[PDB]
Amino acid sequence: MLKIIIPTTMLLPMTWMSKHNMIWINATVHSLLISLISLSLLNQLGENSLNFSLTFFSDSLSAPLLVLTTWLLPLMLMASQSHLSKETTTRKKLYITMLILLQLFLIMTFTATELILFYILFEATLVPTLIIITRWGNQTERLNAGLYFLFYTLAGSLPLLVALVYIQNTTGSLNFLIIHYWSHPLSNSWSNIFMWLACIMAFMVKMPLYGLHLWLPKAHVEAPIAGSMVLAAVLLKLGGYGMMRITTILNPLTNYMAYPFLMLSMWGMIMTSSICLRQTDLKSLIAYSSVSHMALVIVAIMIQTPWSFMGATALMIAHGLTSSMLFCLANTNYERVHSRTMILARGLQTLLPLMATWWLVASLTNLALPPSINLIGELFIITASFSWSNITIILMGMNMMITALYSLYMLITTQRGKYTHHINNIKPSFTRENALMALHILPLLLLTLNPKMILGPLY
């Protein structure tokens, strides 16, 4: 794992010692190179995970997440360098440094062998994200958003810290392999109930679970474009990865401790999808869509079947790509017209045709058109839920309809009709923006050909 990690660290002084006009070029080139090297973790043994050393290991659950992180960094650099043009050299280097530190923390968190190291890195991701949001955020509301993002997260994660140190005192280890091989059932007692809650609530608030989701519209809407990209594509998946890891010590209690979280996630799926139908802000709509998708992932993890875990992995990856693409698409128009309101600019297909094609493809993967991997994940989760109880189809069926509705609503409102007469500063699409969209989209389509790579450990 050292081969991936050291170069990422190297990226730091490479950008601090670069000429003022070459920072973006250098960072993008070597980020792409790092992504290529990482691509080699997808070779998986089968029966067990690849254990590089005592400290790091890679899984089939882990490999897809790492490749997505490393691939997301150059895209964030492409998306950032436009609105950061007026910035001083030192502040541009500081912004790139924040992004690099975030990538470094993320890679380590996914591959840490034991929970305490996972916890420390999973929490260290908070600092660069908060700095990005509050320092480079466009609006006044960013300060409030930063506080919401911090406090919601820490209120969940500190009980997890207490629970983890208690578990290592009683078991003797927090190493994930030892944790798995020496697993013993959790009795049904008040102590075990609160241990379960303390082990679960941090990852629940990271997802986010419905009702503990209020930080996400704030933080995802008030952040700069790269902040939003990394918040939706990767940082939401920390909760899913951590839950998939931690639920091995929680059996057989999960059988009934999962009921309220399943109820919240299914009904709130319906709720956030309906909310997307009456939204005046375009980033707000994409944020709530992310919430709806992660509710599906929460259900999949709580019901604890091989098909549900496979579907959850596929949906996490597909959501990460699609949501980042949608945020970038919204940001291009925002850059044009300097407002987030969805009905301000209309009929953009008449003015920007290729960007309208990108819009259509992103909207089609958001509603999970077959045979995209979005539908693969959603279908696997829906089947597992059907096995869990046949009545889930009603909720699942309803959600599919509302998602199609708001996806095509967004597409029709922004691209179709007639253009607003007054706005006359809509310039042709830049090569940078088109290439950013293609680099989001091509990987998703390519993934359909080889579905097993994003499927996970259960496969």
Partner 1 sequence: GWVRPDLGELSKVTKVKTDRPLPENPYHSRARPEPNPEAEGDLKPAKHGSRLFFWTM
Ligand X SMILES: CCCCCCCCCCCCCCCCC[C@@H](O)O[C@H](CO[C@H](O)CCCCCCCCCCCCCCC)COP(=O)(O)OCC[N+](C)(C)C
Ligand Y SMILES: CCCCCCCC/C=C\CCCCCCCC(=O)O[C@H](COC(=O)CCCCCCC/C=C/CCCCCCCC)COP(=O)(O)OCCN
Ligand Z SMILES: CCCCCCCCCCCCCCCCCC(=O)OC[C@H](COP(=O)([O-])OCC(O)COP(=O)([O-])OC[C@@H](COC(=O)CCCCCCCCCCCCCCCCC)OC(=O)CCCCCCCCCCCCCCCCC)OC(=O)CCCCCCCCCCCCCCCCC
Q: Please give the residue ranges that form the binding site for partner 1 (CB under 8 A).
A: 54-55, 112-114, 116-117, 168, 174
Interface residues toward ligand Y, by CB under 6 A? 152, 155-156, 159, 162-163, 166, 191, 194-195, 197-198, 201, 205, 212
E-assigned strands of 362-430?
Answer: none
Of 234 and 375, nearer to ligand Z (C-beta) is 375
Residue 372 binds which entry of ligand X, ligand Z, ligand Y, none, CB below 5-8 Å type-dependent: ligand Z
Please pick, from the candidates 211, 306, 353, 397, the single residue that binds ligand X as defined by CB under 6 A.
Answer: 211
Query: 407 and 367 in contact (C-beta within 8 Å)?
Result: yes
Residue 114 binds which entry of partner 1, ligand Z, ligand X, none, CB below 5-8 Å type-dependent: partner 1
Amino acid (1-letter code) at residue 426: I
Residue 394: exposure state from Cβ atoms within 10 A (0-12, 13-18, ≥19): exposed
Interface residues toward ligand Z, by CB under 6 A? 55, 120, 124, 353-354, 357, 360-361, 364-365, 369, 371-372, 445-446, 448-449
Neighbouring C-alpha atoms within 13 Å toward the C-beta of 57: 18
Of 132 and 271, nearer to ligand X (C-beta) is 271
DSSP 221-268: HHS-HHHHHHIIIIITHHHHHHHHHHTTSSTTTHHHHTHHHHHHHHHH
Q: List beta partners, residue 114.
A: 175
Q: Measured between alpha carbons, how far is residue 348 from residues 76, 358, 359, 437 in Å?
A: 24, 12, 10, 16
Q: Measured between alpha carbons, how far is residue 94 from residues 7, 89, 136 in Å?
A: 18, 9, 11
**Nearest Cα to 287, choosing from 231, 329, 245?**
231
Residue 185 binds which entry of partner 1, ligand X, ligand Z, none, CB below 5-8 Å type-dependent: none
Considering the complex, what minimum distance in angstroms separates the CB of residue 298 from ligand Y?
14
Binding string, residues 260-279; x marks residues near ligand X by CB under 6 A: x-------------------
Considering the complex, what minimum distance in angstroms separates the CB of residue 317 from ligand Y?
26
Of 7 and 159, nearer to ligand Y (C-beta) is 159
Of 119 and 288, nearer to partner 1 (C-beta) is 119
Considering the complex, what minimum distance in angstroms separates the CB of residue 455 from ligand X?
30
Residue 166 binds which entry of ligand Y, ligand X, ligand Z, none, CB below 5-8 Å type-dependent: ligand Y
Of 116 and 177, nearer to partner 1 (C-beta) is 116
Of 122 and 309, nearer to ligand Z (C-beta) is 122
- Percentages helix, strand, coil for the chain (3-state, rounded to 5) are 75, 0, 25
Q: What region, left, alpha or beta, does residue 338 occupy, with left being phi > 0 and alpha being psi -120 to 50 degrees?
A: left
Within 157-196, the residues that bind ligand X by CB under 6 A are 188-190, 193
Cα(174)–Cα(115) distance, rounded to whole angstroms?
6
Of 127 and 178, nearer to ligand Z (C-beta) is 127
Residue 448 binds which entry of ligand Y, partner 1, ligand Z, none, CB below 5-8 Å type-dependent: ligand Z
Of 114 and 433, nearer to partner 1 (C-beta) is 114
Cα(108)–Cα(117) distance, rounded to whole angstroms?
9
Residue 174 binds which entry of partner 1, ligand Y, ligand Z, none, CB below 5-8 Å type-dependent: partner 1
Query: 20 and 89 in contact (C-beta within 8 Å)?
Result: yes
- Give contact residues for ligand X (rule: CB under 6 A): 188-190, 193, 211-212, 260
